[PDB]
């Protein structure tokens, strides 16, 4: 019937994905803490973005069991992808680094979810 996800599962499963992110430098670099508005000169930001994202809290997420399942995780690195690419100017570093995150996390999950059903 519906599959129960089991929180250290997911993280054991999953974790490697975040990590094979995490080791890109200088590409993960923008991403691994929260986007800070006011620290920027972009108070425009949360205007554009209405649901941020980044890899710490992902991170988080996994680590305090907030995921039910595989694809509400797809679904967050999925979301700090599009929301560099919606904020971001396609000359940016971010928005270049972006696109090379998800080269690399495209080639990640498609075993994992396979091994996870
Ligand atoms: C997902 C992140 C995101 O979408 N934003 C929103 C855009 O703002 C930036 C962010 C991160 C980085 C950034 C770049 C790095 O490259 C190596 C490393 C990095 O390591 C923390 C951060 C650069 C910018 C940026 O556009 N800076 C301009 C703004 C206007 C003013 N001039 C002077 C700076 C955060």
Same mark, same amino acid.
């Given at each position: 019937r519906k599959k129960i996800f089991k929180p250290e599962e997911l993280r054991q499963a999953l974790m490697p994905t975040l990590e094979a992110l995490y080791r890109q430098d200088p590409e993960s670099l923008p991403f691994r +803490?929260?986007?800070d508005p006011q620290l920027l000169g972009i108070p425009d930001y949360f205007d554009i973005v209405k649901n941020p994202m980044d890899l710490s809290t992902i991170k988080r997420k996994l680590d305090t069991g907030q995921? +039910?399942?595989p694809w509400q995780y797809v679904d967050d690195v999925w979301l700090m992808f599009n929301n560099a690419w919606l904020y971001?100017?396609?000359?940016?570093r971010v928005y270049k680094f972006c696109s090379k995150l998800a080269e690399v996390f495209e080639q990640e999950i498609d075993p994992v979810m396979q091994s996870l059903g």
């Open positions: +803490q929260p986007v995921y +039910q399942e971001n100017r396609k000359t940016s």
